């Protein structure tokens, strides 16, 4: 039937558990390395590790050791890109080291680290240059494989550091960094490896960022500037000057993310409305500035704190094929596109299986749907062209219950069902053999494999003892590796499976049949290019070889309506109801308007509403090219005219050096008339004020309110600016008028007396007591009560102009008391100022006389003569019943016995009860 | 009958008019000078002058001239005090000069002036030292009779410059000046001849430096709420003057600091009418009440006057006018202000029926210093150069009036009053009150002359001249010990002056002997001889004796002391008399008690408290016993903390985080050495200090988190306990604001203005709203306001916001229409799903709607305005302007809305519709 070999190997170290990282190194070397690492729970995440090395297809592993003292290698060991050099890092309790090897891990030389470690990053082409992120947010660099080190930046952000492009930027030693400047600022720096001392420079002028520097592998550079009202986003093509990215003007953005800047254009996702659910997919032009709509809604989750994810996948086998998941209402649908985002379509159902009754769904009512990147407790692989295998549902939407493994071998044109429940999938020999293992918690020893692209499957016992399946790997050939811990023991075991005994013959050039790449409409001209791949013949058993030849038949097509899409500000009308696709101009934008900050001398390029698909290679010249070659920019009218006083302004005292400053925005080319009126008769006309750079002096004589009016007049437009100023300076003193003592739940009339009588514009801050934030009042008087007893501080603050006066006063709040009203004589009013000291002394003398006439305690009588113009008094009698005797005694000592007052020479005042 | 000589002289220069100044010079010289000056009307006041000199009792005047070019000497020529030196000043059009003479005006030497002139001032004793006030407010000085000059100060105040005392201050070259410092400050300088400056304490002043001839010095410090006044005795440290604590003062004025005490007048309540007369102690600090109400007017702009007069004949006799309700009464005192009494009526005259007033119902009243003259003349001044002679005009009844002016006199210092003249008369004393001359003050010409030799009991008339003369002025020989009178005036408007020198010496050839005088004991209205604890007796010339009182007059020879009695003591600071006067004792008033310590009593010093009684200052009664009440109280306790104040440097309104905040603390009433200063800045920073107010250095702090904080300070002593609080706010960031307003709306339509700020709900914000033509804005605490527009056209609406100490401001232009028609508009429900409140979205939607309406009706586009409102349900208003045929347009628009659907392509495959709205 079949023919294969299985070789098992157990890691002899029984002290093995948790995780492991297995990696090959180089081609035509046959050397494999394994790192067995032990994680820790309860937020510990501390590690213990062991190293294994093989040099014979992974059949004999030796456990490597380093010195009598065993160094604990951390999880991350870094290989050199493109060049076989290995670096291992170690971490303990605040003590670290490194190990270097240039002999495929044969001789590890130890070196120390004079700093912490978090991650590393090599150079794309230079094998010996590498930089390091120090855990306390530092950036070091080394050009000698990390033997010696030097310092660069000290406040770098997490994982926003990138090397220069190999092909672009002309400089291989550039380092783009994002770092914290000032207190609460972030800026984008650019240094060199050897000289970062004073050589860096700043490409963006302003340089504020909320941690969002991003430069993808290709030629584009991005920047995210946070602002006051609405944030902005800038872009740089070929490291040129930055330009503000053009999004839909009124589709306001919240967050955005760069999905893929592949080939010559950019794909971005922008969440418009804060649904925390749906994103919109937009596509740019060559420079990455003019963005247009592509897809409406896509799923979005926040798995990690800083990392968000968007349900979209590029098929790496065929360039220009994308899959996505939309969410409308509460329904999750799946769509796929071959036109690189122009037109999306649903998935074609298979309607067949090994146990598939054909009563299942038809096109019109329910389709196929797939789980892309989200696994509600999934892998979709694509290493070979046209082979797309994944788990999904089949119906009107996706659900969490059903997980069925479907596959397609012709890039989505023909779908077929294979497995029930999820299965780990592995391709071998450029999609020559497809292996699958059931993902489950129970142990097993089975193995599914297919040779005819998923049409006929075969089972085989690859081992004897059942093993828990942990992972599958393949050679950078037909060597498969299955690693996992067995049922009985808890130690690791690897099984190397060799399919090379079967079909030993090498494929010739005539052993493949041609398969033309089509779409769901049967059209061959995809992206203006007819493509055809090679598929192994069913009646042929051979190995596809060291290098696979495919996509040999590639022809060009003539340009058609399907090869053009809408530009910035244009959308498809009626969903192409009339005939075919038509890009009509939406309401918000018209092609007449100039772009933001068009400066004279430069030339912006407007569009007619149609643009060729980027990287489409159809026969150009004719066929609705619509290349405008529009170079123009018009003269600007005076806009954003601003007038102010030097500093924070809006406060003046008479006879003071007031300095007025004026500023403009759009342009200084035209001669401008500046008419100026300062509201006090001073009329004056000036010219070239914004270009002169000199302020205007003025001194106001009379206190009052004034209005400054300025008019800027040109041949293009006409603008006006106004500024109201107040000159109200003198504030001498204030006073808080308040009763010195009052009972609980009694209405208190607080008053704020100022030096000028009823000032026109005053604000009052009132501080009651324990409550911190004060009350705002426009009137002099307020009314308040006291629920608590004891002593309370009442504070008042006033500020007419830019000067503040403030006064506090302590008041007593009683509880056990009796109230007695008191009339005074009429003559006293002729010698009664509102001075509180006079009132206090009058109350003291009245209390003294009452104590002399009743022989009762003096501290138990409180006299308050009030602030009213008619002299009215209140007598509070405390208890701490016998209180009736004291009350009667006081009433008799008031009525029957006159309480006399010697005010001035020959003037007597009397006090009695008050109705 | 009588015997006298009259010698007339006419200034031969017929070109003479306007004014003249006549002055003598020296004794035993017989030299007189006259300066005839000609003023000019119509705000000109430019002068032309001539000089006359005589050397024989004014019988032969020579018109002096100086050089071929006649220099016009201005009004002021200055003589040397005490020393015969004369200085003349000249003025032209910005060119001046001076003339000096040391030979009684025999040889005038000319010198120039390198500056302007306004007034001069000599030294009390140094004849060659003199200072000058330059018109543009400068002060120059010269020690060589004004030949050479040097500069002192450049911003001096008008007539507040004084020389040092001759007896006091130990320094003769001191100059006390008041000058303007900084911008809007005034200070008191003390300068010397060689260079100018301050040794004594000083501050801000509102032009009120005053140093009377005697040993006292005063100062008036203006403050914020209530001003203060300081005093300095014998040029010592200044002390705050003690007035009644609750009798609040408005203005005060120093009347007389004569002998050993001070008299001040203080207006308590702003009646612009009555002042209160107060008396001080030796140092001039503890003031007590003396008199209640006195008249007060503002005749000149800077000069005020108070109706009170000191009798220069007898020290300690004062006259005053009180005003109660609307009645003006007159009072006099002999006790130097202790007890006042009304005037005794005469009840007799040459034509005096005795039915006139009696004591109980109506008295005598006199016009002291006030001349209410609706008609011609009527000006009254009461003079007293001789002891006991007081002559003046007044009324007789219950009060003073403007009508009646009758000249009364008293020769025994107010004990016996007598009526003399009807209507006013100029009066002149000769030979220490030996001959009394009088001339009727009137507009008509006259040639009569009244004179009396028996102290105003028998009067005689005499034709002193032949032709009737207009009476201009009267003068006498220096010393007032001769009998030469001089009457000057122009005769019958003959355009020239005439002087008449009258000599009474023929009738009085004898020199008085020591036995030609009779004794007159000085008494009061009660007949008591012990006045001021001193029996006094003066000399009066006998009626049967014709002699000249002589070069020097001997009087008050009998002066004996009396034993101290109740009448020789008065109340001290804070004590008043019980019941009323002339009835029933210095009792302590309510506001002050003798327990309290004085202001700023420092440990180690000893203040002297009082019992409520003090001896009349300068009373020389037999002391030792008789209620002396000399306490000899030397003690001082520690003072409690009073007037604790805490603030930020300057007028800090608001603060931003991470800023240099400087806190300052100060005390006022009293100072204490050991002091606890507890301090809490409301952000966890607790700290205790000592000697904060004495160090004088602020405290630095930087707030980190924005918010509101409270600074609390506590001063703790063994005497008391004080606390000071200061609330501060740190609310700095204001990024941007926006005025949300409909771009256009009709007349009398309710407009909802809104002010959007960067924070959605800022806690404490004030909003200033500027509607349009009205200047003063409206104040608001809420974001939104509602207003209308009565006028049409274009209107600017402005809004201003200020949370902390930062201001944001935004304006917007709105259109107000008149000829319009309103159409409501429903939008589709789907549109609400893509409708943000961004105004640009709304404006573009309105623009597209207007475009489609213009395409569907072919009517003008500018006459259709679409406003889609800010409401969450999308509602639109369409305004159709006229500048009838408007019905056709309205019907066309309604049909183009209903019958023809107005489509809107929002997004790919989404159509919106608009129609009419119920
Ligand atoms: C690598 O190995 C393959 C097959 O083993 C061989 O064809 C190839 O030539 C080798 N590479 C080189 C550079 O020789
Ligand atoms: C960089 O610095 C080194 C010294 O550290 C110096 O020799 C070299 O010339 C510098 N290179 C540049 C480009 O500044
Ligand atoms: C400045 O003023 C000159 C003449 O007043 C005018 O020609 C010019 O256009 C103005 N603006 C400039 C130089 O930018
Ligand atoms: C003052 O208190 C009285 C009595 O409680 C109250 O009627 C009045 O409204 C208060 N406020 C005033 C008078 O402004
Ligand atoms: C002035 O002269 C007279 C007459 O000789 C003489 O009595 C008198 O004493 C002189 N004056 C003085 C101040 O001596
Ligand atoms: C005048 O001189 C004194 C001491 O000679 C000096 O203190 C003072 O400052 C001088 N005046 C001025 C204005 O400098
Ligand atoms: C002046 O004298 C004449 C007689 O010589 C006399 O009739 C007259 O009354 C006197 N008085 C006046 C004012 O004429
Ligand atoms: C505190 O202030 C007093 C002044 O009352 C001073 O005498 C003393 O030396 C000061 N102590 C200090 C500064 O330590
Ligand atoms: C008010 O001020 C406090 C500062 O303590 C701040 O935390 C709060 O956000 C502000 N606004 C409201 C509505 O409390
Ligand atoms: C103004 O605002 C109020 C709510 O504060 C609303 O009820 C009213 O309809 C608004 N009126 C206009 C004319 O906008
Ligand atoms: C931001 O700008 C919009 C205009 O698009 C304005 O309506 C709004 O008031 C501004 N401020 C805030 C806080 O949104």
Author numbering:
A (entry chain A): 131 to 212, 216 to 510, 517 to 615, 619 to 1022, 1032 to 1066
B (entry chain B): 131 to 212, 216 to 330, 335 to 721, 724 to 1022, 1032 to 1066
What does the primary publication say about this deposited structure?
We have determined the crystal structure of the unliganded SorCS2 ectodomain at 4.2 Å resolution. The structure of the entire mature extracellular segment of mouse SorCS2 (sSorCS2, residues 117–1072, excluding the signal- and pro-peptide), reveals a cross-braced dimer. Sequence analysis indicates that SorCS1 and 3 share this domain composition including the SoMP domain. Together the six domains adopt an arc shape with a maximum dimension of 140 Å. The two 10CC domains wrap around and interact with the bottom face of the β-propeller, leaving the β-propeller top face exposed (by convention the top face is defined as the β-propeller surface that contains the DA and BC loops). Except for 10CC-a all domains participate in the large dimerization interface that has a buried surface area of 5790 Å2. In the dimer, the two β-propellers are located at the sides, and each β-propeller interacts with the SoMP domain of the other chain. The PKD domains of both chains twist around each other in an anti-parallel fashion in which PKD1 interacts with PKD2 of the other dimer chain and vice versa. The pseudo two-fold homodimer symmetry axis passes through the center of this PKD-based interface and is perpendicular to the predicted cell-surface location. The two chains in the dimer adopt slightly different conformations with largest differences in the 10CC-b–PKD1 and in the PKD2–SoMP connection (root mean square deviation (RMSD) of 1.8 Å over 909 out of 915 Cα atoms, see Supplementary Fig. 2).
The type I transmembrane receptor Sortilin-related CNS-expressed receptor 2 (SorCS2), together with SorCS1 and 3, Sortilin and SorLA constitute the Vacuolar Protein Sorting 10 protein (VPS10p) family that is central to many pathways in control of neuronal viability and function, and has been associated with cancer and neurodegenerative diseases such as Alzheimer’s1 and Huntington’s2. Two roles have been identified for VPS10p members; in particular, SorCS2 and Sortilin are well studied for their function as extracellular receptors for the cognate proneurotrophin ligands to regulate synaptic plasticity and trigger apoptotic signaling, and they are responsible for binding and sorting a diverse set of ligands for secretion, internalization and endosome to lysosome sorting. Each chain consists of six domains; a large N-terminal ten-bladed β-propeller followed by two 10CC domains (10CC-a and 10CC-b), two polycystic kidney disease (PKD) domains (PKD1 and PKD2) with an FN-III topology, and an unpredicted C-terminal membrane proximal domain (residues 958-1066) that we termed SorCS membrane proximal (SoMP). The cross-braced homodimer architecture and the domain composition of the VPS10p subunit followed by two PKD domains and a SoMP domain is predicted to be conserved among the three SorCS members.
